[PDB]
């Protein structure tokens, strides 16, 4: 039983075994749309969910099934469901759970396209959402209504890597009859296990650390079998249609083999870079859970096995400085994703949020000098030199 | 301009050209999650939709863009949007268009998972749906309400390959202020062009004939640029997350190269097989638009350039006969998809709809002896011999 | 037994079946390097070739095995062996068969890199080669020696699509104790079957028509089991190492599904274009086996079921005209391969053979005005218009 | 310049950059056979090697070029050449260098299929080979002849992980006018750099650690540009045809991103497991360069940055014990490859070499109790427990 081995052993083996018919060690790429039955009877036995086996890849596929099983084991969940994207993991989940008249309490400090879905799309389906500062569990409690079905959080959260106390929030949600859904993208199961802290459902964008190689868009949902069966057979099948391609599942299986050693190196690197930035007189602030001045440092130590691979920081001199800095890096690459093997950097005030009113960005935690860094697998000395050179230039 | 060449030339070339940097003839597989910017300024220029280029594959990708452009040309539409599945093409479309309080008029004779989405999921978002017999355009008119945003049809329709008069229905929908959405999966653009008949939006499951090779789940939406931009930047980005993987897009580009020659052969084969079945004294009925006894035969001749690759038929002796028949084929393969290079066969009363009450199936057009056949690229004589042998055995 | 069905049925089905463990219809992509054994005993049973099954993909793989079996059926050969390239199919074959002191009789009119291998590499291994005009079977006989192990031919042959009488040459080779190896790349098994005419071994570059989609480099060898086992376990395993990747095998399996309908359309198109060129007063010569003035026309009719998709022709005005013409096409693409879905064109005197002495090219059949055309799946009217426009411009 | 960064930075970045036309961060998969030219002139400019760019994937491809460049940087070589297999890397190399009448001095302790090529195939091309114990550099010197073109070694070598002193052997080979070719498969460039020690040419099977994921068969050659150009344009193009598919190159690029962190973990694990085995009273011998009793331990410390991921050991009780042991593991997988993320185990006397005469195996270093272990990325405690359990059972 794969649930019995060590976590690195599970990373490598859980959900997978040699192909029964051939012995192939790699999980085969079942790049098929349909599946053949031996008889009328076998076709019937599968459709009524009266007998196990495959029918059609939108419903289930052996390659994707391996990925779902592996991630269920890694998050200590019953079952997994792969999706087309991180967005689809979130929306499949919430659209399965909620209907007209229901309510959601959401953290404000969440991924931007998640916020758009919650702010604009949900209310158009009759589903109301209240946003709160989830670093303050009391605001979550105060926002709960009789109609609240879900509490939704991300931790750590952009853009300043603030935290949410999963265990505390889970207790509050459950006392009030709601489910807790946690987006665990930033951490991966190697660094944080929300189900073990009382969350009901975990979602990821596997696009970030789980795949890790910057070449797959995808999501995963993990939770109880009863829920996952609804997310599969109603949410995905009927509502979003957000299935993962078998090739993408295979790539993610391949990427996740190195999850443990990648996370160790990302976090070792990031701690070094965060300490460098904290010592730098041109840098006003450094946001990183591994720094002891982080305002929720102790919580982070309890909840996270490592402080993560992402750092935010503020450069002296505001917008122009941030722009000059990101324009002066030679090694770090300018891009908006994270969790890849390459170090990526972005300056949201000049890049993504450049048309947004400067005062709105500030309300949103986005100061003019804020830079976000996804630390890769390069030598940290080279990343530090590159940052040092660019900071010197920018200031 | 690719919109100027013949249709076979467009099938091969539209949306594609040699790679500019290398000359590679095959469209490269851009199996990437993110895209790098040259500067802060270039990153900003893309996000505000102020300058063209790529950002992130959930938003857009060069491989997928080629597929979208090709299918837009083939359907004579402005723009295309690829999706994770045929379901996602439909739901992305309808969830973009509709909100709480809106209404849809839908054909009853539609794909089963579409019917589930319309029957069960839409009403839970406050979106009501009226089902009608779309072979009777008057029932569509009578079901229209002030709140009706969309009329939704499939033609030909399962299970008896009845038709819908696209042009007539489009006129009725537009007079009453609604959009017409047509699922053109069964035909492909090679055989039917709903936009040219007044439809506003076409959707496909590319899983069937467009890909054609039984190895891709995917969808596509084609329509006006203004609509497609909303389906991309709200529907997909925010709501369903149903993006297509670049690999799947490349496979579908590859599959669609042979669309014209495949459709010609599927339809040539199917006409021969349909005539054989019509002459067979053990077969009570044959449903095929190429047979002159089809009740909408003339409409079909006007609307469709070929009668298609799908045949339904009823075998003497009801359920037991249908089961014995599908259990007695040696060449045809028992499976529930269609539009693959292999001939596929299914007996819905014993396979898919075996737990459904026999009288409900009958209301739904599914008689106990009904067999559905997706005609492949084999020698038709071999398919005929296989059917002949199995029919003889079954009766 | 797949060897019993019609040829189109075999194209679709031979060598393939639904996956036994899952029912997946598409052959799974077994993208693996190794294979696991259940026990020491099972590992031993495979290595001594004492029991069937897989060990390691360089030796054999289930995806590649399907391709090998399919092509063996299509060529009416016992066994198949896939390779990294068409070159590797040829060299694996000849390096398996021949050793220091042996001799080969080869056609002169062969693929250029084949000629280089025969002219320069073989003699450096002590293997001598005599080149002859294989359109004259007597020259083959006259060149035979006691040490001659192989007679090697291509038909049709570049650059003027001359033919070789397979049956006649086979008889001559066998009387003198030699094997006949035929490169059947230009025809595919759909159009010519050298084994049925007495050849011992057929090779292809699957890069051309068998794959057909311009996205795979690969080869195949077909022949008797005893030979193929030597080509696999010595030639490939030890000598060239030229194994095919499972992904490439899967792509070629996918491409070959449409071989019959592609060849029909390539040849229908090519006959139309060849007739157009023959009627054009700016074109001095047209080389195409489907034209009745071809000097071996009747032989072609006996030996080939279709005249093929390749045309060569000579434009009035020599080198400058040929260059102006290829520079003036808008639809045809300038490239050196053939057998793709797109129409490709090349002018060897200005492109490939531009540094070669003009008189050497002439000895080699390459006149200054010679253009080679690989006819694709576009509308022939569009290809004709494009050629017409470019010829008018060039002259 | 990528040759200036740290080695981990080079692992991630060398040979790669964002796509120029699109910014895609992942190297695109250029899964193409041919490449289009803009004009006759551009086609000519490429063929004569008079201008840079692509022509045809057997000759060169942008995806494969990235892999070749990366591995050249990592081995501190001028140029790289990817191949279909490790075998093809070796044979392409040696068949390029050598012709009838030439001689090779080879280590005896080399990969088995290499030994077959050298023992049986080379002499049939007039190329003689002398095998020597390359742990004794004097035997290499004594075997040199006026005709010796190459000295060929592997280090560490199977089956007992003996070493060869690269620097010493290079000096001996060069004094006598020969090239030194080193198979660096077992180490990877992360652990050993033969070019930096005076080797002329390095080869790998990328099937093992460079790819690392058990899903690619492939090779690479690294050396001087003048040599590599001959290996490409004669060896590969003409002789072996052993090109690598672009997909396989992309997979290997992806796999090699984690080379540094994988090697660190493989070797950390292997040292722990080797120490465990050395302390075990049922284990008579343990072969591992990281153990101080290894007979060439100091050499290993100078030549290798880590002691590697492979261990051989001898179990008490000979053949029956070895068989019982490999039949009793539950976590380790029975297979013949190495360098994958999963721990693999084999007992050559019962598996591979079971039909070989027991006394021949002994001459070859293969004792009846010898087990070979490729240590994966699992928790070492789990691998140790699995070995402990199986050893206890076997004895
Ligand atoms: C387009 C902006 C880049 C996206 C990226 N975050 C994406 C992201 C998602 C959405 O996942 P998908 O992209 O697979 O749908 C979900 N959850 C988190 C925490 C995310 O960071 C970022 O850089 O924040
Ligand atoms: C699972 C049942 C097989 C599905 C198949 N019809 C699927 C299908 C879809 C849905 O497309 P996707 O599967 O890509 O989401 C949409 N539209 C039509 C007309 C369809 O036939 C059939 O055999 O009818
Ligand atoms: C590089 C020149 C293009 C090659 C192409 N002929 C390639 C080719 C080969 C070699 O096959 P591979 O390329 O798979 O090794 C073998 N046999 C024939 C008849 C060929 O035409 C041509 O256009 O003639
Ligand atoms: C089939 C036996 C398994 C092969 C494996 N060694 C394969 C191998 C090769 C050959 O490489 P390819 O397989 O990519 O052609 C070259 N060099 C070394 C050192 C090898 O170990 C082993 O387990 O030793």
UniProtKB/TrEMBL annotation, chains A, B, C, D:
In Gene Ontology terms, what is a biological process of this protein? transsulfuration
Q: Which residues carry this modification: N6-(pyridoxal phosphate)lysine?
A: 208
Q: Name one GO cellular component term.
A: cytoplasm
Show the InterPro entries listed in the entry: Cys/Met-Metab_PyrdxlP-dep_enz, L-Met_gamma_lys, PyrdxlP-dep_Trfase, PyrdxlP-dep_Trfase_major, PyrdxlP-dep_Trfase_small
Pfam hit, one: Cys_Met_Meta_PP
Q: Does the keyword Lyase apply?
A: yes
* Chemical reaction(s) catalysed: L-homocysteine + H2O = 2-oxobutanoate + hydrogen sulfide + NH4(+) + H(+); L-methionine + H2O = methanethiol + 2-oxobutanoate + NH4(+)
Q: Which residues carry this modification: N6-(pyridoxal phosphate)lysine (covalent)?
A: 208
Which positions carry Cysteine sulfenic acid (-SOH)? 2, 113, 191, 243
List the keywords (alphabetical). Answer: Lyase, Pyridoxal phosphate
Q: Which cofactor does it need?
A: pyridoxal 5'-phosphate
Listed EC numbers = 4.4.1.11
Q: Name one GO molecular function term.
A: pyridoxal phosphate binding
Query: Does the UniProt entry include the keyword Transcription regulation?
Result: no
Q: Can you tell me which residues bind pyridoxal 5'-phosphate?
A: 56, 58, 86-87, 111, 205, 207
**What does the record note on quaternary structure?**
Homotetramer; dimer of active dimers.
Family listed: Belongs to the trans-sulfuration enzymes family. L-methionine gamma-lyase subfamily.
| Name the UniProt record assigns to this protein | L-methionine gamma-lyase
Q: Which organism is it from?
A: Citrobacter freundii
